[PDB]
């Protein structure tokens, strides 16, 4: 029993983290085989950052301008190239700790584990969801740029996020490992704001099933609703529409608990319209939307 925000074990990724220094700018890189991937922001100085022309900045660099340190071992850079908002630094040594890996791009509503790092050294691990507005609510300080997000499946690490920046609201933005930003953001120190965000309805329902599996049942009712009538309510509360595919994905949790998906929707409708009236669900006084159906199944009894 129990339900916690749980990250994947980080060791496979820890063995891949390095420090990249260009001039006085330092950040983290990801060393897989004979390539180190890092944010192209490493080539900017403080003043370059308002309006950097990265192609210009890069053509003025050579391999020797990049110092890559893996623990107490300096790696010699023997080539460099830019791919979108990441740099690929070819090094003379293949990382002996490279795990099986993929570069995947995730969807809004999906979760992943973040290994926060500073100076190439891992400092903490936590779970994040990609919000509907393509930001993440992380915990990152200066020096964290280049920290990565990932999921693990059967010892294959699927890297999905590289951290770049913090927006004025305190949320975070970054790229996939091909260097393409999630969302309408750019790697420069300008006023940028995310679109209005929405609540991930299917994940709230998944977490309500986790709660039932864990013995929290007070929010259940003998009522039901239609999908159409539910979405009419969800729209008023700034929840994403719930699709038939979402209903299907919740099938296994519905089967395990005996609570039809549309019945749980009726419970959520009542929670939205009434609030919690002083009670908690799985230790929270708010409706939690950062657990996917997979996260619930992975963690909850069968």
């Amino acid at each position: 029993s129990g339900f916690r925000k749980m990250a994947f074990p980080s060791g496979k990724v820890e063995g891949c983290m390095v420090q990249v220094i260009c001039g006085t700018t330092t950040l983290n890189g990801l060393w897989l085989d004979d390539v180190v991937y890092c944010p192209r922001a490493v080539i900017c100085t403080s003043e370059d950052m308002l309006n950097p022309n990265y192609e210009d900045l890069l053509i003025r660099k050579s391999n020797h301008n990049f110092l890559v340190q893996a623990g107490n071992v300096q790696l010699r850079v023997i080539g460099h190239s830019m791919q979108n908002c990441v740099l690929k630094l070819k090094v003379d040594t293949a990382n002996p700790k490279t795990p099986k890996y993929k570069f995947v791009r995730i969807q809004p509503g999906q979760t992943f584990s973040v290994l926060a790092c500073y100076n190439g050294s891992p400092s903490g691990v936590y779970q994040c969801a990609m919000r509907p507005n393509f930001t993440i609510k992380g915990s990152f300080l200066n020096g964290s740029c280049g920290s990565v997000g990932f999921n693990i499946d059967y010892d294959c690490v699927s890297f999905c996020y590289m951290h770049h920046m913090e927006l004025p609201t305190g949320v975070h933005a970054g790229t996939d490992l091909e260097g393409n930003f999630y969302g309408p953001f750019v790697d420069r120190q300008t006023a940028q704001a995310a679109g209005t965000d929405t609540t991930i309805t299917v994940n709230v329902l998944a977490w309500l099933y986790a709660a039932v599996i864990n013995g929290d049942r007070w929010f259940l009712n003998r009522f039901t609703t239609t999908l159409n009538d539910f979405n009419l309510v969800a729209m008023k509360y700034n929840y994403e529409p719930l699709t038939q595919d979402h209903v299907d994905i919740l099938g296994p949790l519905s089967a395990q608990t005996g609570i039809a998906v549309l019945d749980m929707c009726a419970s959520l409708k009542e929670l939205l319209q009434n609030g919690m009236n002083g009670r908690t669900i799985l230790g929270s006084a708010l409706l939690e939307d950062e657990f996917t159906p997979f996260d619930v199944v992975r963690q909850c009894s069968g």
Binding site: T25, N142, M165, Q189
Partner: peptide
């Protein structure tokens, strides 16, 4: 306020 590229200084 502007976005911040969260690199470090050294």
């Amino acid at each position: 306020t502007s976005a911040v590229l969260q690199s470090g200084f050294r």
